[PDB]
RNA sequence: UUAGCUAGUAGGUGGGGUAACGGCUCACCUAGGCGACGAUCCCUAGCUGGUCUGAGAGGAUGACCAGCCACACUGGAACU
RNA sequence: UACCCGCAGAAGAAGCACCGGCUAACUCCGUGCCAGCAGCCGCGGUAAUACGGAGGGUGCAAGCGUUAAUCGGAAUUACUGGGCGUAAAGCGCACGCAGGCGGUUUGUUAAGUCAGAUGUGAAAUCCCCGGGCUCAACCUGGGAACUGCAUCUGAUACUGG
């Protein structure tokens, strides 16, 4: 309000927390799968979206989402967690970037292969 | 001791030695007291290669400063030319 | 010619030393507000004669014990 | 408590212009007369006069041009509690030269343009447009 | 660093002639420049302010022969240079060596002028320059090497360039096929159908 | 002759005993490349009728602005119910750096170099009135000299 | 949602010690010194010229280089 | 070694993302709230220009997208540049310390303020004017700037003593 009140109590900021706490300012984090399963998204959406509870190497254990169509993930699988949330999945805050150590690219895809780790067809 | 020598501030394959009065204990391209002109061994004709200030160089060398081997040669060349 | 400051003594319960409270005027860097700031200094004055309440004039010198690096030069407005 | 006479004068003249008054009588002051001199010189007002022996009263006459008030906006700048001091380089310009940014300095209170011409800064008093 | 596809799809998408052909035939008689290329060229939707700004920028870029990075660098140079931003951008684009060679008429198109520049065929002030973005200073002399002065392409381009309106800021003589760069071209000298306000606003966004 | 641009079309609707009925409201701005500029707000059942109704009212409510040769005279501010616009003149080649509904009204008012910024509710219906009121209240050197009794050379 | 901290600590007298001023340290005297203009305590953090964003004001930041600081498996110490 | 000269052939060299609105770009085929997309609005219940494939177009280019971090927009911490009757905001009220502000005239001083000058604010860096690598990146000379501090000299219109 007044200049004297501003001098007394400074016009402080408002710190906002990140939406990817388990990354600790890192683009990708290597982790090991712990629980591979499928969950039903919140209404009005309805599906069997494939998610994975994975414990990162730093110690954090989160749940990520598997994109594309078809994957070869199971227990004791090394994946590369990437930062990104799914709006229609309560709790999911991360994805698994394809083309990594074990999560191979999507089969029979020829468009947007950069986001799914698919090699250039011959 | 206090000496007047050359510090290279050019690039890859492009040397450019500024004449600086730097202490002998300091680095070649690090700390220095004052800068006295420059030298460009790659500059062709029509370009002023050397601009050493003889007045301040003499003023410094009077107070115990030491002129380096190449600096003395450049000063001699400048004096012979003009 | 030489730098000197003027302040108000607030405590002298020590041997050959006084405590001064100099006030200065500055402008707030952010809000542009003129507020009064204090710079308290430990000043040593041999042959103690200054009480509490009057203003004093000091000059910078070498440190004497740990934190008083100022001497008293003149005593102006000694009235209580 | 009346803690700012300049603000009171600005409020009185601004309300008189809004209400289409002819004269606005008020208790005057040295700075009020100095500001009224600037207003007369710049033509924003019509006339100012100090009438009083023990309690001087300034009676400014409002100026109207085809119904519209001559002064568009009157704004206090260096109000008591927030003082503004700008040098010659950073002297303000009101309405790109169409308004005055009155400055008080050592050589009296002439105006922002005269302060710039003389090459001395000062403190801003009133923005009149 | 240059477009290697068809030279008329861009023109028909923009809607006008971008001078990307020689000029021996007519653009209308050589292509179908009335609608956009593709299955939905006939369908004409409504374009917003961003759409028209992008269309103008793409038209300018296709006319001159530059990419996004170079165009943005030229825009920054024009902005930092005092004066009209659009006029400065146009002057900087015109100052390219390939563009002045095309104006002189040593190449049928800008894609050929720059090819001649890069193939050690242009000899400016006795020094060969292979940069299509080489800025040409006033009173600069642009010439052609001996191994390219006696080519069929340069003569054909020179005799074809007579159809177009000759620029008023060059003094090229065809006796030795050498030109001198006069005072820089202006907004009135250049075409008035290029809206530089859209260009200066699109990058300001 | 005169240039015209409609800025935004809305789909306001009413409710009746038998259901909800629809309607359209169109906001248009007209100008001539000079200080003359106006705005119109038409209400009809379809977009062409709405824009054609808005155009006539804009033309009949056109107002004059004392603009300069290629820009405005001095920076101005316009305050409406929910829109606060601030416009300032620029130099040759800067362009019309404005957003929302202000760009169209400035373009039809003829100012080629201008920097504008809107604070508050940026709805077109209110921001058009805000910028029109801000442009209509700006002064000119000749007018201020006439109203003050001085000369344009004196107040430079 | 850290309101009291400090007994070599505030100052003074006298001696000894470093290149010098210095509670730098001992021996006596006066109980002072710091603190709502944030003492004390907790967490984090090398500083600066600079860098990025922003019309500016501001916000974040200290890659390379340059100047300064601190550290050589960890702690303690001394000699030339 | 830079650089130049002759060989012969168009060869030895283009990919990536997007296409419902934001935002530049639409048409068919395949499932059928299933596969799935997703930054927000939200889409998939026989064709959703929104999923996958194709055609086409759009954008960038030896780069193209995603992720990690900062700021603008966010006037959404507002000194520049916001509000408190109803969207969040007058203490339930009064007294009062420190603190903030302060009616009017004159005299004194010059702390705040203003003008000039000096020292300095390293170099590097930004900006302006020029030069050298075929040109740019890069380097470089001069200028400006470093909006700051200290000192000295003059003004009291204003604040303060
Ligand atoms: Mg003791
Ligand atoms: Mg901000
Ligand atoms: Mg080790
Ligand atoms: Mg979309
Ligand atoms: Mg609010
Ligand atoms: Mg309520
Ligand atoms: Mg309420
Ligand atoms: Mg109440
Ligand atoms: Mg050059
Ligand atoms: Mg510097
Ligand atoms: Mg007084």
Swiss-Prot record, chain B:
Originating organism: Escherichia coli (strain K12)
Induction: Part of the rpsP-rimM-trmD-rplS operon.
Family matches, as Pfam families: Ribosomal_S16 (PF00886)
Primary gene name: rpsP
Function: In addition to being a ribosomal protein, S16 also has a cation-dependent endonuclease activity. In-frame fusions with the ribosome maturation factor rimM suppress mutations in the latter (probably due to increased rimM expression) and are found in translationally active 70S ribosomes.
Protein name: Small ribosomal subunit protein bS16
Family according to the record: Belongs to the bacterial ribosomal protein bS16 family.
BP GO annotations: cytoplasmic translation; ribosomal small subunit assembly
InterPro entries: Ribosomal_bS16 (IPR000307), Ribosomal_bS16_CS (IPR020592), Ribosomal_bS16_dom_sf (IPR023803)
GO molecular function, one term: structural constituent of ribosome
Cellular component annotations (GO), alphabetically ordered: cytoplasm; cytosolic small ribosomal subunit; small ribosomal subunit
Keyword Hydrolase recorded: yes
This protein's UniProt keywords: Endonuclease, Hydrolase, Nuclease, Ribonucleoprotein, Ribosomal protein
Keyword Nuclease attached: yes
PANTHER family to which the protein is assigned, alphabetical: 30S RIBOSOMAL PROTEIN S16 (PTHR12919), SMALL RIBOSOMAL SUBUNIT PROTEIN BS16M (PTHR12919:SF20)
Subunit relationships: Part of the 30S ribosomal subunit.
From Swiss-Prot, chain D:
Record note on quaternary structure: Part of the 30S ribosomal subunit. Contacts proteins S5 and S12.
Coiled coil: none
InterPro entries referenced in this protein's UniProt entry, alphabetically: Ribosomal_uS8 (IPR000630), Ribosomal_uS8_CS (IPR047863), Ribosomal_uS8_sf (IPR035987)
Function: One of the primary rRNA binding proteins, it binds directly to 16S rRNA central domain where it helps coordinate assembly of the platform of the 30S subunit. Protein S8 is a translational repressor protein, it controls the translation of the spc operon by binding to its mRNA.
This protein's record includes keyword Repressor: yes
Origin superkingdom: Bacteria
Transmembrane segments: none
Keyword Membrane: no
Descriptive protein name: Small ribosomal subunit protein uS8
Cross-referenced PANTHER family: 40S RIBOSOMAL PROTEIN S15A
An annotated GO cellular component: cytosol
Gene: rpsH
Annotated GO biological process: cytoplasmic translation; regulation of mRNA stability; regulation of translation; ribosomal small subunit assembly
MF terms in GO: rRNA binding; structural constituent of ribosome
Family under the similarity heading: Belongs to the universal ribosomal protein uS8 family.
Keywords: Repressor, Ribonucleoprotein, Ribosomal protein, RNA-binding, rRNA-binding, Translation regulation
UniProtKB/Swiss-Prot annotation, chain E:
Cysteine-cysteine disulfides: none
Any Gene Ontology CC annotation: small ribosomal subunit
InterPro entries: Ribosomal_uS4, Ribosomal_uS4_bac-type, Ribosomal_uS4_CS, Ribosomal_uS4_N, S4_RNA-bd, S4_RNA-bd_sf
SUPFAM superfamilies: Alpha-L RNA-binding motif
Keyword Ribosomal protein included in the entry's annotation: yes
S4 RNA-binding domain: residues covered: 95-155
Keyword entries, A-Z: Antibiotic resistance, Repressor, Ribonucleoprotein, Ribosomal protein, Ribosome biogenesis, RNA-binding, rRNA-binding, Transcription, Transcription antitermination, Transcription regulation, Transcription termination, Translation regulation
Xref: Gene3D superfamilies: Ribosomal Protein S4 Delta 41, Chain A, domain 1, RNA-binding S4 domain
Phenotype upon changing residue 50 to D: In rpsD101; suppresses a temperature-sensitive mutant of release factor 1, R137P. Not a ram mutation
GO biological process: cytoplasmic translation; DNA-templated transcription termination; maintenance of translational fidelity; negative regulation of translational initiation; response to antibiotic; ribosomal small subunit assembly; ribosomal small subunit biogenesis; transcription antitermination
One annotated GO molecular function: structural constituent of ribosome
Entry-linked HAMAP family: Ribosomal_uS4_B (MF_01306_B)
Family statement drawn from the similarity comment of this UniProt entry: Belongs to the universal ribosomal protein uS4 family.
NCBIfam families noted in UniProt: PRK05327.1, rpsD_bact
Annotated protein name in UniProt: Small ribosomal subunit protein uS4
Curated annotation (Swiss-Prot), chain F:
GO cellular component terms, semicolon-separated: cytoplasm; cytosol; cytosolic small ribosomal subunit
Record key words, sorted: Acetylation, Antibiotic resistance, Ribonucleoprotein, Ribosomal protein, RNA-binding, rRNA-binding
Classification via PROSITE patterns: RIBOSOMAL_S5, S5_DSRBD
Domain of life, source organism: Bacteria
Entry-linked InterPro entries: Ribosomal_Su5_D2-typ_SF, Ribosomal_uS5, Ribosomal_uS5_bac-type, Ribosomal_uS5_C, Ribosomal_uS5_N, Ribosomal_uS5_N_CS, Ribsml_uS5_D2-typ_fold_subgr
Effect of residue 103 to S: In strain: NEA-319; neamycin resistant
A molecular function GO annotation: structural constituent of ribosome
Ranges where the S5 DRBM domain occurs: 2-65
Listed GO biological process terms: cytoplasmic translation; maintenance of translational fidelity; response to antibiotic; ribosomal small subunit assembly; translation
NCBIfam families: rpsE_bact
Free-text comment about domains: The N-terminal domain interacts with the head of the 30S subunit; the C-terminal domain interacts with the body and contacts protein uS4. The interaction surface between uS4 and uS5 is involved in control of translational fidelity.
Miscellaneous notes: Altered uS5 proteins have been identified in a number of mutants. Some mutations in uS5 have been shown to increase translational error frequencies. Some mutants in this protein can partially suppress an alanyl-tRNA synthetase mutant.
PANTHER family linked: MITOCHONDRIAL RIBOSOMAL PROTEIN S5
Family: Belongs to the universal ribosomal protein uS5 family.
Protein name, entry field: Small ribosomal subunit protein uS5
Organism for this UniProt entry: Escherichia coli (strain K12)
């Amino acid at each position: 309000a007044t200049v004297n009140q501003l001098v007394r109590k400074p016009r402080a900021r408002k710190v906002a927390k990140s939406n990817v706490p388990a990354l600790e300012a890192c683009p990708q984090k290597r982790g090991v799968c712990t629980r591979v399963y499928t969950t039903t998204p919140k209404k009005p959406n309805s599906a069997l979206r494939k998610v994975c509870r994975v414990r990162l190497t730093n110690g954090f254990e989160v749940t990520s989402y598997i994109g594309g169509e078809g994957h070869n993930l199971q227990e004791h699988s090394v994946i590369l967690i990437r930062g990104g949330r799914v709006k229609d999945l309560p709790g999911v805050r991360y994805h698994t970037v394809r083309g990594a150590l074990d999560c191979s690219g999507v089969k029979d895809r020829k468009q947007a292969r950069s986001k799914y780790g698919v090699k250039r067809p011959k | 001791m206090v000496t007047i020598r050359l510090a290279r501030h050019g690039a890859k394959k492009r040397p450019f030695y500024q004449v600086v009065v730097a202490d002998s204990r300091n680095a070649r391209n690090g700390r220095f007291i004052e800068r006295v002109g420059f030298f460009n061994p790659i500059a062709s004709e029509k370009e002023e290669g050397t601009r050493l200030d003889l007045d301040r160089i003499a003023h410094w060398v009077g107070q115990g400063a030491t002129i380096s081997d190449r600096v003395a040669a450049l000063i001699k060349e400048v004096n012979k030319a003009a | 010619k030489i730098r000197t400051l003027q302040g108000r003594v607030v405590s002298d319960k020590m041997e050959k030393s006084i405590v001064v409270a100099i006030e200065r005027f500055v402008k707030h860097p952010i809000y542009g507000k003129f507020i009064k700031r204090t710079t308290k200094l430990h000043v040593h004055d041999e042959n103690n004669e200054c009480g509490i309440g009057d203003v004093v004039e000091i000059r910078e010198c070498r440190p004497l014990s740990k934190t008083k690096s100022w001497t008293l030069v003149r005593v102006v407005e000694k009235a209580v | 408590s009346m803690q700012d006479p300049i603000a009171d004068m600005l409020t009185r003249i601004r309300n008189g212009q809004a209400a289409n008054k002819a004269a606005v009588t008020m208790p005057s002051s040295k700075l009020k007369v100095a500001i009224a001199n600037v207003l007369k010189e710049e033509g924003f007002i019509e006339d100012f006069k100090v009438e009083g022996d023990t309690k001087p009263e300034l009676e400014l006459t409002l100026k109207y041009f085809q119904g519209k008030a001559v002064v568009e906006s009157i704004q206090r700048v260096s109000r008591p509690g927030l003082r503004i001091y700008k040098r010659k380089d950073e002297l303000p310009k009101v309405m790109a030269g169409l308004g005055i940014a009155v400055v008080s300095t050592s050589k009296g209170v002439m105006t922002d343009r005269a302060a710039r011409q003389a090459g001395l800064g000062g403190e801003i008093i009133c923005y009149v447009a | 660093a240059r477009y290697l596809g068809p030279k008329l799809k861009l023109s028909r998408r923009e809607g006008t002639d971008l001078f990307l052909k020689s000029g021996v035939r007519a653009i209308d008689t050589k292509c179908k420049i009335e609608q956009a290329p593709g299955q939905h060229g006939a369908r004409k939707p409504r374009l917003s302010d961003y759409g028209v700004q992008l269309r103008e920028k793409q038209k300018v870029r296709r006319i001159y022969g530059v990419l996004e990075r170079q165009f943005r660098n030229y825009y920054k140079e024009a902005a930092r240079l005092k004066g009209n931003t659009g006029e400065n951008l146009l002057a900087l684009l015109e100052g390219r060596l390939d563009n002045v060679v095309y104006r002189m008429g040593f190449g049928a198109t800008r894609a050929e002028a720059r090819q001649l520049v890069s193939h050690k065929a242009i000899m400016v002030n006795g020094r060969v320059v292979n940069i299509a973005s080489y800025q040409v200073s006033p009173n600069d002399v642009v010439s052609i090497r001996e191994k390219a002065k006696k080519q069929s392409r340069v003569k054909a381009a020179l005799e074809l360039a007579e159809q177009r309106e000759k620029p008023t800021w060059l003094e090229v003589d065809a006796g030795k096929m050498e030109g001198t760069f006069k005072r820089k071209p202006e907004r009135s000298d250049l075409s008035a159908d290029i809206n530089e306000h859209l260009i200066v606003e699109l990058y300001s966004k | 002759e005169l240039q015209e641009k409609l800025i935004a079309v809305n789909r306001v609707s009413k409710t009746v005993k038998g259901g909800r009925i629809f309607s359209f409201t169109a906001l248009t701005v007209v100008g001539d490349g000079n200080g003359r500029v106006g705005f119109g707000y038409g209400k009809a059942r379809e977009v062409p009728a709405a824009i054609q109704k808005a155009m006539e009212k804009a033309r009949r409510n056109m107002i004059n602005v004392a603009l300069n040769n290629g820009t405005l005279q001095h920076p101005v501010k316009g305050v409406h119910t929910g829109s606060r616009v601030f416009m300032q003149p620029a130099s040759e080649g800067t362009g019309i750096i404005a957003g929302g509904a202000m760009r169209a009204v400035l373009e039809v008012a003829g100012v080629h170099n201008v920097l504008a910024k809107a604070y508050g509710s940026t709805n077109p219906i209110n921001v058009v009135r805000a910028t029109i009121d801000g442009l209509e209240n700006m002064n000119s050197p000749e007018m201020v000299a006439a109203k003050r009794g001085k000369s344009v050379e004196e107040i430079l």
